[PDB]
Amino acid sequence: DGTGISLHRQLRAIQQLARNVQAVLGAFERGTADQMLHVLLEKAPPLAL
Amino acid sequence: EDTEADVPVTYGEMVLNGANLVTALVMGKAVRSLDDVGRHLLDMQEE
Known about the structure:
Chain A: Belongs to the herpesviridae major capsid protein family. This is part of a larger assembly, with 2 copies of chain A. Chain A is mainly α. Chain A has one helix at 8-40. The first copy, chain A, is rod-shaped and about 70 Å long. The N and C termini of chain A lie far apart (71 Å).
């Protein structure tokens, strides 16, 4: 609307898109570590054997 | 018919200029001319 609130409601949808996109790009930085253990436990037989 | 011409005016407008943009959003209430009423309320108690 160009009024004082409809300038602001734009900014609230920007911060969500920013902090939605900051999480999922960081998720592959976390999904990398989760991809370690489920193929390192394809190998690595136990120490007792 | 005293004359045949008169003197009207134009619209005065009322826009959320300053503090009313915060009080409508951060709070709920948005009391009109709060730039002036807040000036008058801060002028009375200090004497």
